[PDB]
Swiss-Prot record:
Organism: Homo sapiens (Human)
Subcellular location: Nucleus
The gene coding this protein: RAD23A
Assembly and oligomerization: Interacts with XPC; the interaction is suggesting the existence of a functional equivalent variant XPC complex. Interacts with PSMD4 and PSMC5. Interacts with ATXN3. Interacts with UBQLN2.
Designated name of the protein: UV excision repair protein RAD23 homolog A
Occurrences of domain UBA (ranges): 5-45
Phylogenetic lineage: Eukaryota, Metazoa, Chordata, Craniata, Vertebrata
Length: 48
């Protein structure tokens, strides 16, 4: 289980690719905090 501070740095690190906070938050929820899947969803779409 990542800590809350590790979540915030994960979130900010992905935001550095040019995504707004609320989209990254939604992608990390959809990925269960796996950053690889979150970035996949931001690049090429959520499942479905």
């Amino acid at each position: 289980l990542v800590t809350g501070s590790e979540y915030e740095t994960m979130l900010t690190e992905i935001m550095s690719m040019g995504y707004e906070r609320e989209r990254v938050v939604a992608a990390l929820r959809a990925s269960g905090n796996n950053p690889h899947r979150a970035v996949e969803y931001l690049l090429t779409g959520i499942p479905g």
